Amino acid sequence: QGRFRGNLSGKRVDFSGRTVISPDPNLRIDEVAVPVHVAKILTFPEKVNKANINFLRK
């Protein structure tokens, strides 16, 4: 719980989620199915760059 192990080597991190895990044989090995609720809370910052401009506006 001390600063060296608790707050420096390992730190609480933003942009993360924990849910129970269930099977899905229909998913490729490189994919994970994410609940729509966790998807709405977790966000990725994307800069407008002339190829994402139309997609971002929608």
């Binding site: 849910t19 269930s22 899905d24 044989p25 490729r28 994919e31 994970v32 609940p35 729509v36 998807a39």
Partner: peptide, 15 residues
Amino acid sequence: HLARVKPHRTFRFNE
């Protein structure tokens, strides 16, 4: 893992 959003709440992966 690549992420594909699905309606059910649970992190489902291939077994």
